[PDB]
C-alpha cells in the first residue's frame, strides 16, 4: 500500500475537440497523476497529466486566459493547468469553494 487517491470527482473540462465544456470524472493520485475519464467507472480514459513533471503553472479564477466559462458560471469556478508541451487544460467546478478545494490539492500534487 504505497499509493492511493488524494481527490476524485466530477469537473467540466473544455474540450479542444468539441470546442465546448464536457463533463469528466477526475482522480488525483498520490504520486501526482491526474487522470480523467468519460465517466466515474474509470473505464474510458480521456487523458492524463503528470502534475510534478508536466505542470508549469496553475491559474484560478480571473487568472484564467482564453477560455469562456460555462453559461451561467463565473471565472471564479475555473482552474487552468498549464503544461510544458504547450497544452492548457481548462476546468470548471460547480462553485468557487469547489474550485478552491481543487486548486490547493492540485498545487500540492505538483510537489509529489
Swiss-Prot record:
Keywords: Endosome, Membrane. GO terms for molecular function: phosphatidylinositol-3,4,5-trisphosphate binding. Residues 4-111 form the PH domain. One of its GO terms (cellular component) is recycling endosome membrane. GO terms for biological process: regulation of cell differentiation. A 1,2-diacyl-sn-glycero-3-phospho-L-serine binds at residue 22. It is found in: Recycling endosome membrane. The PH domain specifically binds phosphatidylserine, which is enriched in recycling endosome membranes, it doesn't recognize PIPs. Involved in retrograde transport of recycling endosomes. This is Pleckstrin homology domain-containing family B member 2. The chain holds residues 1 to 110 of 222 of the full protein.
Amino acid at each position: 500500500g504505497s499509493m492511493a487517491f488524494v481527490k476524485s470527482g466530477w469537473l467540466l473540462r473544455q474540450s479542444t475537440i468539441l470546442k465546448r465544456w464536457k463533463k469528466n470524472w477526475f482522480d488525483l493520485w498520490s504520486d501526482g497523476h491526474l487522470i480523467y475519464y468519460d465517466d466515474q467507472t474509470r473505464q474510458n480514459i480521456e487523458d492524463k497529466v503528470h502534475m510534478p513533471m508536466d505542470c508549469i503553472n496553475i491559474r484560478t479564477g480571473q487568472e484564467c486566459r482564453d477560455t469562456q466559462p460555462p453559461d451561467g458560471k463565473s471565472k471564479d469556478c475555473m482552474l487552468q493547468i498549464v503544461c510544458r508541451d504547450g497544452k492548457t487544460i481548462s476546468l470548471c467546478a460547480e462553485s468557487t469553494d469547489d474550485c478552491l478545494a481543487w486548486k490547493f490539492t492540485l498545487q500540492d500534487s505538483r510537489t509529489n
